[PDB]
Amino acid sequence: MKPHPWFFGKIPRAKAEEMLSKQRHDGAFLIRESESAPGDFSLSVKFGNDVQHFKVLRDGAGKYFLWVVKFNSLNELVDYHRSTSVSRNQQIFLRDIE
Amino acid sequence: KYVNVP
């Protein structure tokens, strides 16, 4: 019924870090179209005093993934990580940018 | 470089 508040399209990596650092909550995130790899997508998340970047990988079947679990759409990848840690290093759960 | 792909 309403558009997703996490799609920022084509913004530079540095721009995403800029906006996210201003966020008050860990897990604040946005999906941006990648700069190192055009056509691809990147996930930027605020965590502590930093902004971490995750590359959205793709396979031959068009599925999206960050680690091992594969998703059929960015939408599902995003929702899954609202309850499950987006990272295997630290426990980080996606929260909408405010 | 990314968290999931150093």
- Give the DSSP per-residue string, A17-56: HHHHHT-SSTTEEEEEE-SSSTT-EEEEEEETTEEEEEEE
Write the single-letter amino acid at A52: Q
Output the CA angle A92-A28-B5, nearest 5 degrees.
Answer: 55
How many CB pairs below 8 Å do chains A and B form together? 18
| Partner-chain contact B4 A42, CB within 8 Å | no
Of A39, A38, A41, A40, residue with least CA distance to A30: A41
How do A70-71 and A64-65 pair as beta strands?
A: antiparallel
Write the single-letter amino acid at A61: A
Q: What domains lie within chain A, and their CATH numbers? A: 1-98 (3.30.505.10)
Kindly state whether A55 is in contact with chain B, defined as any CB-CB distance less than 8 angstroms. Answer: yes
How is residue A58 written in tokens? Answer: 């793709």
Dihedral sign from CA coordinates of A24, A29, A33, A38: positive
DSSP 3-state percent helix, strand, coil across chain B (nearest 5): 0, 0, 100
Residues in Cβ contact with A40 at an 8 Å cutoff, skipping those fewer than 6 apart:
A33, A34, A55, A56, A58
